[PDB]
């Protein structure tokens, strides 16, 4: 419901690196395809295509990828808001 | 706007009716031909008094509207009347759809 | 003449890569290609027709339906883009509606006249997908639900989307990103835990969870062996059972031809009556109940009977491995008798003498009483009055639709003008008029769908610009800019060069962009060209 | 054509069509060409065309009798009115091209209009001229550049007039079956091609559920059904 918005005040494409769930990126790719913004759709498809985010990986690999993205995103939020 | 609502004593009439039928020659009194014509629509049917002058040159389909009319009865059959202030005025032609089923002139 | 429907997942989750370096959609396309290659090994493969459905909107979901040649299927399969939601339920409903599009118009489903295994249109739906959870614009559904918002006409008669002769095999791609070599891979292909597995199980099929290319090849080899003309029947142990899966499991029976031919229909699940306005809804799989008690497998000469061989299952063969071909287990369908809730046996399961296969023999609705009478007539005899009274009593306890096949049976047997000549169908005129109207509506909707499989249109280039109706179009895909004809198509970058070229072309003085398929097709080019003087390890390397 | 000038012109066209115009290759281009609506429309006064548009846009099925009888008694009551009926038939066939959306609605179908036009031919010559006018478009049918509106009233008349007025259906079928070899044997193949194209157009856009009962109707005469089977085995 939030990604459906279009009055974003945060750099939408830049934060696509920090999604690790594959269904969120699936919805993102669908949204960009429906709205026609092909380039951001390519960014989303590239994000999905990352080998580390393959949903059927060993569990600890997914956990570590999620953890590193969590760390990077929270550090970015700290730099933005502090 | 229904044909059914032609009552005696009405004022500021703006009703619309179509003369699809033709009046027929008949005798009344001695020397005058007060012809009569009947029309029907989806709401109802009512007769229209036709004078000799209009009845000679009449062709079907004309649209006329009366003002300050007064309803009249002719041998148990309702009949519209014009005069003593009333006046007729043609509007258009052919822009109508009829329905001959609700006619009350049947036996 | 089977049907192979490939319900390829086109949700954006199919863009996940694997150690192969290709996306899941690429491996799905390759799986379909290899399935075709393995299928082509069999001589019978020339008769199949392939179908393609994707996880797109309904007007574009079907892209290879009926009346579509193989080349169109291949062209559509190559140009698949994984960009939608994981709308598994809606797409599966679209696939089942596509398969059941032509059933009513040709009347293959004999509604209210028993079920005929010889009137089948055998199809299997191979849905290749990843394991990621189902998604819709509202959210994640996390449980597969088939929508019924716009039912096809007459759908309520079967009250289940999947039909008698249809199965769903799921090929769930679980190829890990980084390679993980495991010695456990040498074992058999396991079942998947995703939302599609129960839907596969109920309709007679099963899911597959491949986790490596060799496991994918094994799964595709297994799939090719699992395509076979037949129908799916739900079995149930009647009375005291002997719970392990063999008590009640959906299973297939092979319907071999020589087109298919058979006489006795499987009985309905309800007692027919001419007074009811509408037929009851019948479950797609006829739940036949078998009695574990031994019984005599009777048979008489010149009797139209059908032998159907059940698909092999391990425990059923193991228990039937006990040598007992001389005996058989009777089978009946519940709620077929006018009074009893159990019904009379219409057949039996007699394993063959060699014990190689377990064969279902289908007989009249109540055979152990009729067959002695018919045998008595054909042996002793001009039937006796008592014999005809017994036949009439039997007919009082026999559903009307059986009389027609019985009429043909007695006609071929040598009693052309038996009591069956009175004729009957045993339904309401309302029901028959309803079937006629359903046939008309089915023809109309089928023609509409076949007309609509093309969808020769692209997505709107609008943007829906907000005043926070003027829009900015996207790139003009397939525009074919007529640079010579229109001066606005000349970029400033190369204005002078194109100016010179169009000037020189205009005086007395897009090509070389042919598609790849038509790039090296020397046959057409030589056929177009005039003929010359008359004549006096890897596999393909072009020009044979 | 009885005037010797037209005979001379036709003979000159036959001998050398390029003589009268170098770019005019022959009658092939004229036959394959199409007639524009302006020629068919321009012979009618605006009142009649507006009345027909009103009838096809406002009048529901059933009321058509009054308007057409009025127009017939007022105007179409002359010896030359018989050819004027053919002119009106050509105008309806070529110019009037209603939308499919209005077709789906319960507005007055054109089969009644065609039936009224045909039943008013009180002489054999008038009926022959009207039938020739109806079959003029059928000679050179082309699906890509022509609409199905030129044959939908025809098939609707055949399907609707089977029970109440078999005579009209039988006469039209006999005339269209016998016109095929009689018209022009050097170009009769084009007539058969046009008939096959029209039949294929009816098949592809199923106005009727099945065309099978009408082709072999029990109440139609034997020879008609026999030659229908003989000429077109594809629709059997």
From Swiss-Prot, chain A:
Enumerate the subcellular locations listed in this protein's record, separating them with semicolons.
Answer: Nucleus; Chromosome
Family label: Belongs to the Integrator subunit 8 family.
Disease note: Neurodevelopmental disorder with cerebellar hypoplasia and spasticity: An autosomal recessive neurodevelopmental disorder characterized by global developmental delay, profound intellectual disability, seizures, absent speech, spasticity, facial and limb dysmorphism, and subtle structural brain abnormalities including cerebellar hypoplasia.
Q: How does it assemble?
A: Component of the Integrator complex, composed of core subunits INTS1, INTS2, INTS3, INTS4, INTS5, INTS6, INTS7, INTS8, INTS9/RC74, INTS10, INTS11/CPSF3L, INTS12, INTS13, INTS14 and INTS15. The core complex associates with protein phosphatase 2A subunits PPP2CA and PPP2R1A, to form the Integrator-PP2A (INTAC) complex.
Q: What is known of its domains?
A: The WFEF motif is required for the recruitment of protein phosphatase 2A (PP2A) to transcription pause-release checkpoint.
Could you tell me what this protein does? Component of the integrator complex, a multiprotein complex that terminates RNA polymerase II (Pol II) transcription in the promoter-proximal region of genes.
Name of the protein described by the UniProt record? Integrator complex subunit 8
- What organism does the record attribute this protein to? Homo sapiens (Human)
Gene (UniProt) = INTS8
Swiss-Prot record, chain B:
Q: Which UniProt keywords apply?
A: DNA damage, DNA repair, DNA-binding, Nucleus, Phosphoprotein, Ubl conjugation
Main location, first listed in the record: nucleus
Q: Does the keyword DNA repair apply?
A: yes
- Gene Ontology biological-process annotations: DNA damage response; DNA repair; double-strand break repair via homologous recombination; establishment of protein localization to telomere; mitotic G2/M transition checkpoint; positive regulation of telomere capping; response to ionizing radiation
A GO MF label: DNA polymerase binding
Share what the entry says about its subunit structure, partners included: Component of the SOSS complex, composed of SOSS-B (SOSS-B1/NABP2 or SOSS-B2/NABP1), SOSS-A/INTS3 and SOSS-C/INIP. SOSS complexes containing SOSS-B1/NABP2 are more abundant than complexes containing SOSS-B2/NABP1. Directly interacts with ATM, SOSS-A/INTS3 and RAD51. Interacts with INTS7.
Please explain the role this protein plays, according to its UniProt record.
Component of the SOSS complex, a multiprotein complex that functions downstream of the MRN complex to promote DNA repair and G2/M checkpoint. In the SOSS complex, acts as a sensor of single-stranded DNA that binds to single-stranded DNA, in particular to polypyrimidines. The SOSS complex associates with DNA lesions and influences diverse endpoints in the cellular DNA damage response including cell-cycle checkpoint activation, recombinational repair and maintenance of genomic stability.
Looking at the UniProt record for this protein, which Gene Ontology cellular component terms does it annotate, in alphabetical order? chromosome, telomeric region; cytosol; nucleoplasm; nucleus; site of double-strand break; SOSS complex
Q: Where are the transmembrane segments?
A: none
DNA-binding listed as a keyword: yes
Gene name linked to the record:
NABP2
UniProtKB/Swiss-Prot annotation, chain C:
GO terms (molecular function) for this protein are: protein-macromolecule adaptor activity; transmembrane signaling receptor activity
- Give the comment on domains: The inhibitory loop acts as a regulator of protein phosphatase 2A (PP2A) activity: Asp-541 and Glu-542 residues mimic phosphoserine and phosphothreonine residues and bind to the PP2A catalytic subunit PPP2CA active site to block substrate-binding.
- Using the record's annotation, list all stretches that form the VWFA domain: 3-227
What does this chain do?
Answer: Component of the integrator complex, a multiprotein complex that terminates RNA polymerase II (Pol II) transcription in the promoter-proximal region of genes.
Tissue-level expression reads: Widely expressed. Expressed in heart, brain, placenta, lung, liver, skeletal muscle, kidney and pancreas.
Q: What induces it?
A: Frequently down-regulated in nonsmall cell lung carcinomas and prostate cancers. Down-regulation in prostate cancer is due to CpG hypermethylation of its promoter. However, some involvement in cancer is unclear.
User: Where along the sequence does the record place the motif called Inhibitory loop?
Assistant: 538-544
What keywords tag this UniProt record? Chromosome, Nucleus, Phosphoprotein
Q: How does it assemble?
A: Component of the Integrator complex, composed of core subunits INTS1, INTS2, INTS3, INTS4, INTS5, INTS6, INTS7, INTS8, INTS9/RC74, INTS10, INTS11/CPSF3L, INTS12, INTS13, INTS14 and INTS15. The core complex associates with protein phosphatase 2A subunits PPP2CA and PPP2R1A, to form the Integrator-PP2A (INTAC) complex.
Which organism encodes this protein?
Answer: Homo sapiens
Q: Where can this protein be found?
A: Nucleus; Chromosome
State whether keyword Phosphoprotein applies. yes
A cellular component annotation (GO) from this entry: INTAC complex
Name the chain's protein. Integrator complex subunit 6
| Keyword Magnesium (UniProt) | no
Swiss-Prot record, chain D:
| Spans traversing the lipid bilayer | none
Q: How does it assemble?
A: Component of the Integrator complex, composed of core subunits INTS1, INTS2, INTS3, INTS4, INTS5, INTS6, INTS7, INTS8, INTS9/RC74, INTS10, INTS11/CPSF3L, INTS12, INTS13, INTS14 and INTS15. The core complex associates with protein phosphatase 2A subunits PPP2CA and PPP2R1A, to form the Integrator-PP2A (INTAC) complex. Component of the SOSS complex, composed of SOSS-B (SOSS-B1/NABP2 or SOSS-B2/NABP1), SOSS-A/INTS3 and SOSS-C/INIP. SOSS complexes containing SOSS-B1/NABP2 are more abundant than complexes containing SOSS-B2/NABP1.
Q: What does this protein do?
A: Component of the integrator complex, a multiprotein complex that terminates RNA polymerase II (Pol II) transcription in the promoter-proximal region of genes.
Know the name of this protein? Integrator complex subunit 3
State the compartments where it is located: Nucleus; Cytoplasm
Q: Which family, according to the similarity comment? A: Belongs to the Integrator subunit 3 family.
């Amino acid at each position: 419901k939030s990604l459906q918005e279009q009055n974003s005040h945060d750099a939408m494409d830049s934060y696509y690196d920090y999604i690790w769930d594959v269904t969120i990126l699936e919805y993102l790719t669908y949204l960009h395809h429906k709205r026609g913004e092909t380039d951001k759709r390519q960014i989303a498809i590239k994000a999905i295509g990352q080998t580390e985010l393959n949903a059927s990986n060993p569990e600890e690999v997914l956990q570590l990828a999620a953890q590193r993205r969590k760390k990077k995103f929270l550090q970015a939020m700290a730099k933005l808001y502090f | 706007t229904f044909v059914k609502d032609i009552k005696p004593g009405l004022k500021n009439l703006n009703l619309i009716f179509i003369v699809l039928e033709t009046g027929r020659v008949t005798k009344t009194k001695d020397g005058h031909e007060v012809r009569t014509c009947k029309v029907a629509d989806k709401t109802g049917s009512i007769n229209i008094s036709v004078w000799d002058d209009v009845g000679n040159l009449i062709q079907p389909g004309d649209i006329i509207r009366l003002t300050k009319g007064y309803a009249s009865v002719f041998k148990g059959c309702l009949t519209l009347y014009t005069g003593r202030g009333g006046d007729l005025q043609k509007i258009g032609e052919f822009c109508m759809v009829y329905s001959e089923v609700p006619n009350f002139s049947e036996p | 003449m089977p049907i192979l429907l490939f319900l390829i997942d086109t949700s954006a989750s199919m863009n996940q890569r694997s150690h192969l370096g290709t996306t899941y959609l690429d491996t799905a396309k390759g799986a379909v290609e290899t399935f075709m290659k393995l299928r082509a090994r069999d001589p019978a493969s020339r008769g199949d027709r392939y179908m393609l459905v994707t996880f797109e909107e309904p007007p574009y979901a079907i892209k290879a339906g009926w009346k579509e040649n193989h080349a169109t299927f291949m062209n559509e399969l190559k140009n698949l883009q994984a960009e939608g939601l994981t709308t598994l339920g809606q797409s599966l409903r679209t696939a089942f509606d596509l398969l059941n599009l032509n059933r009513l118009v040709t009347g293959i489903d004999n509604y209210g006249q028993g079920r005929n295994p010889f009137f089948l249109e055998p199809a299997i739906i191979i849905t290749i997908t990843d394991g990621s959870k189902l998604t819709t614009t509202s959210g994640v559904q996390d449980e597969l639900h088939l929508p019924l918002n716009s039912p096809l006409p007459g759908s309520e008669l079967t009250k289940e989307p999947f039909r008698w002769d249809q199965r769903l095999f799921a090929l769930v791609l679980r190829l890990p990103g980084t390679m993980s070599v495991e010695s456990e891979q040498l074992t058999g292909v396991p079942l998947d835990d995703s939302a599609i597995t129960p839907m596969c199980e109920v309709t007679g099929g099963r899911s597959y969870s491949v986790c490596s290319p060799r496991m994918l090849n094994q799964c595709l080899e297994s799939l090719v062996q699992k395509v076979q003309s037949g129908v799916v029947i739900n079995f149930e142990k009647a009375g005291p059972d002997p719970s392990q899966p063999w008590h009640s499991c959906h299973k297939l029976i092979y319907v071999r031809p020589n087109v298919p031919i058979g006489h006795w229909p499987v009985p309905e699940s309800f007692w027919p009556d001419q007074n009811s306005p509408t037929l009851p809804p019948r479950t797609s799989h006829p739940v036949v109940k078998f009695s574990c008690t031994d019984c005599e497998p009777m048979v008489i000469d010149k009797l139209p009977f059908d032998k159907y061989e059940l698909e092999p299952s391990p425990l059923t063969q193991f228990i039937l491995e006990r040598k007992s071909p001389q005996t058989c287990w009777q089978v009946y369908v519940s709620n077929s008798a006018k009074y009893s809730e159990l019904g009379h046996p219409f057949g039996y399961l007699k394993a063959s003498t060699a014990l190689n296969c377990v064969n279902l023999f289908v007989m009249p609705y109540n055979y152990p009483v009729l067959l002695p009478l018919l045998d008595d007539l054909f042996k002793v005899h001009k039937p006796t009055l008592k014999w005809r009274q017994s036949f009439e009593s039997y007919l009082k306890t026999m559903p009307p639709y059986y009389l027609g096949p019985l009429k043909k049976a007695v006609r071929m047997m040598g009693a052309p003008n038996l009591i069956a000549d009175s004729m009957e169908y045993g339904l309401s005129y309302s029901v028959i008029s309803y079937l006629k109207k359903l046939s008309q509506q089915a023809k109309i909707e089928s023609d509409r769908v076949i007309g609509s499989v093309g969808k020769k249109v692209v997505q709107e280039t609008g943007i829906k610009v907000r005043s926070r109706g003027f829009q900015v179009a996207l790139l003009n895909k397939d525009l074919k800019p007529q640079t010579f004809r229109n001066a606005y198509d000349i970029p400033r970058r190369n204005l002078l060069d194109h100016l010179t070229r169009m000037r020189s072309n205009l005086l007395k003085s897009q090509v070389h962009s042919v598609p790849i398929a038509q790039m090296g097709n020397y046959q057409e080019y030589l056929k177009q060209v005039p003929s010359p003087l008359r004549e006096l390890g890897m596999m393909i390397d072009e020009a044979d | 054509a009885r005037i010797p000038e037209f005979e001379l012109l036709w003979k000159d066209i036959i001998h050398n069509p390029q003589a009268l115009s170098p770019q005019f290759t022959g009658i092939l281009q004229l036959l394959q060409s199409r007639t524009s609506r302006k020629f068919l429309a321009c012979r009618l006064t605006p009142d009649m065309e507006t009345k027909l548009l009103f009838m096809t846009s406002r009048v529901r099925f059933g009321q058509q009798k009054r308007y057409q009888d009025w127009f017939q008694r007022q105007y179409l009551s002359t010896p030359d009115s018989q050819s004027l009926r053919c002119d009106l038939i050509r105008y309806i066939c070529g110019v009037v091209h209603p939308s499919n959306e209005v077709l789906s609605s319960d507005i007055l179908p054109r089969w009644a209009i065609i039936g009224w036009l045909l039943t008013t031919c009180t002489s054999n010559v008038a009926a022959s001229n009207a039938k020739l006018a109806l079959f003029y478009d059928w000679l050179f049918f082309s699906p890509d550049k022509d609409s199905i509106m030129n044959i939908e009233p025809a098939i609707l008349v055949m399907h609707h007039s089977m029970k109440p007025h078999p005579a009209i259906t039988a006469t039209l079928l006999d005339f269209m079956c016998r016109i095929i070899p009689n018209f022009y044997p050097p170009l009769e193949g084009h007539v058969r091609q046009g008939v096959f194209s029209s039949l294929n157009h009816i098949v592809e856009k199923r106005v009727l559920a099945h065309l099978a009962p009408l082709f072999d109707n029990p109440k139609l005469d034997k020879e008609l059904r026999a030659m229908l089977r003989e000429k077109f085995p594809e629709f059997c």
